[PDB]
Every structure is written in C-alpha cells, then in structure tokens.
C-alpha cells in the first residue's frame, strides 16, 4: 500500500503544484483515493492460509 499510495500521491501532487487553472475541489485526489481503496480491498481480501 505504501508503494500504491506514494505513486498516487505523486500524481495528485504534481497536479496541485503545476496546474495553471486548478480548481479548489480535489477531484483528482478523490478518484485516486478510490483506486487505492479498491487496491487495498483485493489485497487485504486475500488469505494466505489454505481454506
């Protein structure tokens, strides 16, 4: 998750810093937040132990 969150952290950041007409809404991050939340779910949903 640290790898996934950091990678999406850079994308959300580079839009904050270098955007000319950025809106004060945070839309890009929220979409990024969903992808990390989904990635966490399937990553956590797995069980190493055999069932």
């Amino acid at each position: 998750i640290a790898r996934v969150l950091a990678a999406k952290a850079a994308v959300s950041l580079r839009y904050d810093a270098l955007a000319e007409d950025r809106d004060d809404s945070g839309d890009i991050g929220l979409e990024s937040r969903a992808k990390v939340e989904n990635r966490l779910s399937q990553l956590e949903g797995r069980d190493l132990r055999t069932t």
Binding site: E44, G45, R46, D47, R49, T50, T51
Partner: protein, 422 residues
C-alpha cells in the same frame, strides 16, 4: 473400523452430558458476553436474570419476542436439561430454538440480543446442538465482532469447514471465502431450506436479502467457465427465485430480479423457462419499486434469447398480463428515458403481440417504433405481420400511417417484404 474411530463417534454424541468436572468447565466456559475465567464462576440464575431483562428490551422493540418468555425464558427453564429429555421433547425444543434464531437474526446489532442468546448458549447449548441454525442466521454479519465470537465457541459442521481457519483468528473471515462456502452445492440446498423458512414466516430483512443476493450472484460468476456446474446450479437457485417472487415483500422480489438476470446472461435458457419466468414475475408485481426493477428484468431476459422466434410475439395470456401491470403509457415512458437499456427484442415481440391481439392500440405502434431504433431483421418481421393485417383487417388511417412511416424510412425493405408477400 478401528476402536479409536468408533469411540470418537461416541464422544461426539456425548458432547454435552457434562460427565465430570473438567467437562463441566469447558461447556460452561463457552460464552458470548464473558471471558472464560469469569464464565466458569457464574451460575444459571445470574445468567437468566440478565436474559430476562434483555428479552424485555427486545420485546419493546418487537412484540413477537414476548412469546418465548412463556417457553424458553420462563423461570421453569432453569431446571430444564436437554440430555435428560426424550427424543420427542427435544424436537419441540429445537423448533422453538430455530424460531427464535430467526427473530434475533435481524437484531444482532442491538446489544440486548447478545445477552438474550447467552441464555440459550448456556442453558440449551445451541452452540453444540443447533450449530447450523446459529451460523446461518449470523452469516451476513461475518465482518461484525459478534460473528468472531460465535466461531470461537462453536464446532464447525462438515459443510462450514471453509471457516475452520477463522476460528480464534484475529482477522475476520474475508468476503472471498464466503463465496467458497456458498460454492458447494450441498450448502446451497441447506441455505435454500433456511431461506425458505424465512419466506414462510416473512422474517426477511433487507440486509439478509442483500447478502444472500450477493453470494448467489457471485457463485454464478465463479462458475461461468464451467458450463456443467452452471447446469446443476439452475435447479437450485431458480427454484429460490420462484419462492422469492412468491413473497409479498418487495425487497424479496427485487432480489429475485437480480438473481434471474445474471443467469440469463450467464447461461442461455430455453424460451419456455424465460416465458415461465415472466408469468411468475408479473403475478405478484404490486410494489412500484419492484415494478421498475421488473421491467428492466423482462427486457434483459429477452436480449439473451438467441434462437428462432427470438422476436416472436408473446403468448396471449402473457400479453394480457403484461399490459395489466404495464399500461401502454408506462412503456412509452420507459422508451422515453435516454439512458434506457437495450430492449429491442422485447419491443419487437411486444410490437407483434399488439397486431395479433389488440387492434385499437395499433396507433401506439407508431409511437413505439419512433422512440426506439429496432434492428433491420426486427423491422422486417414487423412489416411482414402488418402486411397480413391489411389483407385481413380493414384498412385504417393508423394502419396506412404505419406503412407510411416505413415508406419514409428504409423504403426499399418495404418492397422486399411486399415482393415476398404479395
């Protein structure tokens, strides 16, 4: 068989006798509110006192719980033991317990229910005898802390061994494993029976239907590649759909709408099964919200039809039933909304049914065709039937107008049908 194996079967039967002190400690130690060390110290009177109060709070929330006060939570129940009773008596006790587990299925979030069930766990050892009913009622709370406690104090039946790992484990059972438990067919028959009891008693609630729906849908998806298993799934799960559709409660019917649609896309079916499905869907369609879900389901089913007569007209009984629950104005409204699902095949069938059976609606045909773009093969079938209409039915302004519409759009196809027919 070896001597050890047979003695094991004797032990399993004799689990709740409490022959000696050490056995009495393990049995009495199991609890849903208290830890082991405190549990051993308590007495039945103290436990029952909490339950009597807890049941009273549940009674205020729901009057039905008050009945068990006369049977399971009565002061005489303190002296009642299951090991000492006869075979006939234990069945009545099991029936009383199973009924209670149904009512408490929806109130597990409330604190008092966890106290009330403690009396049954301690007094009647439902965690050993009625193990299956307890797990089935609390299946949807699998992530809740209450479900974790249930696993720790319960010995899993042979069908539920998918949860064997998650007994006394920090992580709660994952969503993925619940699909595995439902995947085995034997569990589905078991869950079907429990679900059937809920419908008979009208004990269903949204959360159960949501969880029951989600597992059934997923089971189909997990079996999409293996056709032969999907075939074995149809007898079980479609049978559930008939039962859910029988229920008056709308949320039960909507779950049937979810589960039917996924098979239709998952596995092509005979038209007779599809047509039979419509009649059941339309028989008990009264709730508006169910009414919306039904219409999408009807359209989705026909799209899966991929055989000759796919766009054949509906049978007469089916047509009259459909118009009763969906007047012509409604379907036009459905055709209006821009985000409509693809429904061309059903409208082609519904179109031809009007020409065969209802002449006065023939004007509506003009409106319907304009709103939705039908496939070329569908249009050809419509033209062919309308041609026969003119020969038989008297010529009408609406009738010629329908041709006149087909004159305006794709005139050449009109000649081809006329050339082949007349």
């Amino acid at each position: 068989s070896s001597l050890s194996d047979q003695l094991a079967q004797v032990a399993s039967n004799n689990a709740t006798v409490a022959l000696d002190r050490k056995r009495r400690q393990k049995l009495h130690s199991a609890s849903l509110i208290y830890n082991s060390k405190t549990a051993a110290t308590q007495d039945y009177d103290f436990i029952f006192e909490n339950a009597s109060k807890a049941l009273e709070e549940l009674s205020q929330i729901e009057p039905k719980f008050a009945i068990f006060s006369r049977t399971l939570f009565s002061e005489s129940s303190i002296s009642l033991d299951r090991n000492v009773q006869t075979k006939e008596e234990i069945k009545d006790l099991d029936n009383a317990i199973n009924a209670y587990l149904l009512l408490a299925s929806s109130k597990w979030y409330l604190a008092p229910t966890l106290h009330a069930t403690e009396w049954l766990v301690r007094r009647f050892q439902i965690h050993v005898k009625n193990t299956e009913m307890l797990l089935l009622s609390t299946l949807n709370y699998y992530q809740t802390p209450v479900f974790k406690r249930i696993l720790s104090i319960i010995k899993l039946p042979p069908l539920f061994n998918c949860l064997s790992n998650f007994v006394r484990s920090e992580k709660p059972p994952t969503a993925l494993t619940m699909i595995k438990l439902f995947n085995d067919m034997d569990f589905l028959k078991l869950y079907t029976s429990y679900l059937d009891q809920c419908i008979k008693h009208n004990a269903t609630y949204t959360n159960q239907l949501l969880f029951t729906t989600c597992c059934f849908i997923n089971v189909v998806a997990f079996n999409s590649n293996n056709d032969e298993k999907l075939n074995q799934l149809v007898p079980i799960l479609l049978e559930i759909s008939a039962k859910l559709l029988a229920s008056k409660s709308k949320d039960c019917q909507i779950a049937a709408h979810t589960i039917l649609v996924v098979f239709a896309t998952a596995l092509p079916l005979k038209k007779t099964i599809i047509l039979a499905a419509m009649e059941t869907i339309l028989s008990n369609l009264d709730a508006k919200e169910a009414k919306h879900s039904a219409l999408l389901t009807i359209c989705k089913l026909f799209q899966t039809l991929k055989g000759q007569g796919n766009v054949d007209q509906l049978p007469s009984k089916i047509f009259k039933l459909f118009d009763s629950k969906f007047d012509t104005v409604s379907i036009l409204t459905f055709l209006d909304k821009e985000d409509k699902p693809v429904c061309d095949k059903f409208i082609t069938s519904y179109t031809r049914s009007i020409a065969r059976y209802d002449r006065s609606k023939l004007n509506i045909i003009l409106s319907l065709l304009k709103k939705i773009r039908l496939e070329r093969y569908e249009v050809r079938l419509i033209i062919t039937d309308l041609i026969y209409l003119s020969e038989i039915l008297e010529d009408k302004s609406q009738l010629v107008e329908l041709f006149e519409y087909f004159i305006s759009i794709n005139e050449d196809l009109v000649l081809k049908c006329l050339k082949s027919l007349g």
